[PDB]
Amino acid sequence: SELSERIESFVETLKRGGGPRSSEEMARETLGLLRQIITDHRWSNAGELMELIRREGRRMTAAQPSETTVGNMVRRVLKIIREEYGRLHGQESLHKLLTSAQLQSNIIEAINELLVELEGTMENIAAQALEHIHSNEVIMTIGFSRTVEAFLKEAARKRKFHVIVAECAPFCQGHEMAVNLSKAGIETTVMTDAAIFAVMSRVNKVIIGTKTILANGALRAVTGTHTLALAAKHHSTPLIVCAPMFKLSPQFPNEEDSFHKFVAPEEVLPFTEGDILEKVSVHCPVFDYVPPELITLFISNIGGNAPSYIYRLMSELYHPDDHVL
Amino acid sequence: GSELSERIESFVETLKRGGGPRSSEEMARETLGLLRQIITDHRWSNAGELMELIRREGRRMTAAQPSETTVGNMVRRVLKIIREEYGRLHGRQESLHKLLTSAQLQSNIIEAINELLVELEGTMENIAAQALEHIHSNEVIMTIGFSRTVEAFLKEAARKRKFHVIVAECAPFCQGHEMAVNLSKAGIETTVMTDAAIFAVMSRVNKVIIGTKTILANGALRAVTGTHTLALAAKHHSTPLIVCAPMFKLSPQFPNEEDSFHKFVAPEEVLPFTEGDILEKVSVHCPVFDYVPPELITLFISNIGGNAPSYIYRLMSELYHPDDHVL
After folding, report:
1. Which long-range contacts (CB under 8 A, 24 or more apart) does A3-12 make?
2. What is the effect of changing residue 147 to F (chain B)?
3. Residues 6 or more apart from A12 whose CB is under 8 A from it?
4. By C-alpha distance, which of B118, B38, B120, B119 is closest to B82?
5. Hey, which residues does A44 pair with through a beta bridge?
């Protein structure tokens, strides 16, 4: 009842406009909502609970497939029920092929500790940040993302370096990073996207955030990230991606081409142009697809990793059956 | 003349024994002076006779030290000058157009040789005058070995700009250390590294500026040892590479047309004689010249301006004759 109306409000907020802007807020709200779902709805066996979770997660994902934090948090919860059921009652590999009613409290405590560990991902990333920045380095970022801004603005407490931020047109939110970071004395620079390659030779390394990392190591980021990665590969400069663990989602690029997110073309082309708006077709995607071959490293709350290892993290977070959801 | 033969013998002995003169510019000037004396203080009637004499002297000088090409380049330039003078005094390139369309010489040749010396004199300043347009403030420039042309280039550039220079010593002949002091005497904030570390530091280098010993026809280079590795690292990081090379260093030969392209010296520098027993089985090689393919070269800078490697064939065609690549 009350939980149902809260779920409906959450779905409507996702459909219209994200209230809690930070992805961490999305993860915390999704986990809390799943907590009241588990506590309130009645179930005898784990199967009906799993299918109810499948239905609710399907509804929430269908509300807005552009962002996948809700989806992979739901998948993590489903794996939590699977693990708890296997523990209280009793991974695909060649070894497997050759060889061969009180869990509610355990589920609740698992979700609680998941929230506790999710709280400190930013702090862990900041703690390990200092080992990848040396004095008088040149760093370039794209758009706005709180992870990398915390990264740099804490790693500059003991080091001095230069930072270049390219505005992510049309949503010129790189200016926000520039202002916030220059309010910490970092000697930053504000730049357009069209100049990326023009300056890319004189950059030591490039650190970027992301919105979602796929299974193959390819990621979905803000528009223009693919061009930056291509320039990096051309100049062979290392590329660092700062992404917490919950931004890892088990889908794959070729899925119905509902991958990008197209917004109103008002930002790209103002409505004041007039007559020419009929014969002209305008596209304003907000996300770009970066292949895994252009990525050098992954920094998460657990440490450093290579893209070629990303698949393993998939097996430790999501059961293969719950990919389709 | 007796003194002409004396000077020829002294020159060939100096070339074949060791170094001298110190700078390739001085060697080219001495070769041009010797050739001028040969042309003046000798008897000859037909242009063919003079060309045969010049060819014999050039063959002898090249056989004295094949690894040194400046003498051969000067001889071929003199031969081309003789050909042009005879052609435009008697009559009036090997192109498709030519395919489809079928007494006072000595003074003119001497005047042309004097013009060649005059433009040789100011080659270093001609190269260094355009340094300011290739360096920006707070740049990082990496250099290998020892080269007076690059030294003058960087000194001229540093007059009105500030940047950092990283020099890799060219082991075993660690002549880069001279850079290490010389640029330091100009206050350019230089750093010294062993030449085992190029790639390790290479990612932090904005541009690489190097000299060379010889430029081949296809656009390749004969440089100091390890320059091939530096060029490979530059190509890997796609950092632009600059070859400060005067005009007189364009040999019309080709890389694999011959051997002894590398020059081998005593292995004492690499491995000292004090090792003793292990030297009795160990084979040691100390090549002092390395081959740089033209693919890894981004730009050539000469006393006439900048050029791409793909255009080198034209310049080599504008200074020599195809029938003189055999000498």
Report:
1. A3/A33, A3/A36, A3/A37, A3/A40, A3/A41, A6/A33, A6/A36, A7/A33, A7/A37, A7/A56, A10/A60, A11/A59, A11/A60, A11/A63
2. In VWM2; with ovarian failure
3. none
4. B38
5. none
Q: Please tell me if residue B204 touches chain A, with a CB cutoff of 8 Å.
A: yes
Residue B76 burial (CB count, 10 A): 24
Strands of B221-224's sheet, edge to edge?
B214-215, B221-224, B289-292
Chain A: residue whose CA lies nearest to B136: A202
CATH 3.30.428.10 at A126-316, yes or no: no
Task: Give the up-direction half-sphere exposure of residue A102: CA atoms within 13 A in the CB hemisphere.
Answer: 0
Would an 8 Å CB–CB cutoff place A236 in contact with chain B?
yes
For residue A138, the chain B residue with the least C-alpha distance is: B204
Contact between chains at B203 and A204 (C-beta distance less than 8 A): yes
- CA B176 to chain A, closest CA, distance in angstroms equals 25
Cβ neighbourhood burial of A272 (10 Å; 0-12, 13-18, 19+): exposed
Distance between A198 CA and the closest CA of chain B, angstroms: 13
A237 CB within 8 Å of a chain B CB:
yes
Count A/B contacts: CB-CB distance under 8 Å.
Answer: 16
Architecture of domain B128-318: 3-Layer(aba) Sandwich (3.40)
Looking at residue B21, the DSSP 8-state letter turns out to be S
For residues A206 and A319, give the distance between their C-alpha atoms in angstroms, rounded to a whole number: 33
| Cα dihedral: B169, B174, B178, B179 (round 10) | -20
| CB-CB neighbours of A152 under 10 Å | 25
- Which residues from B are below 8 Å from A237, CB to CB? 203
B203 touching A, CB under 8 A?
A: yes
Nearest to A204 among B204, B238, B239 (CB): B204
For helices A23-40 and A2-16, give the axis angle rounded to 10 degrees: 160
> Which long-range contacts (C-beta less than 8 Å, at least 24 apart) are formed by B33-39?
B33/B117, B34/B7, B34/B8, B35/B74, B35/B75, B35/B78, B35/B113, B36/B110, B36/B113, B37/B4, B37/B7, B38/B4, B38/B8, B39/B78, B39/B106, B39/B109, B39/B110, B39/B113
> Resolution in A for the shown PDB structure?
3.6
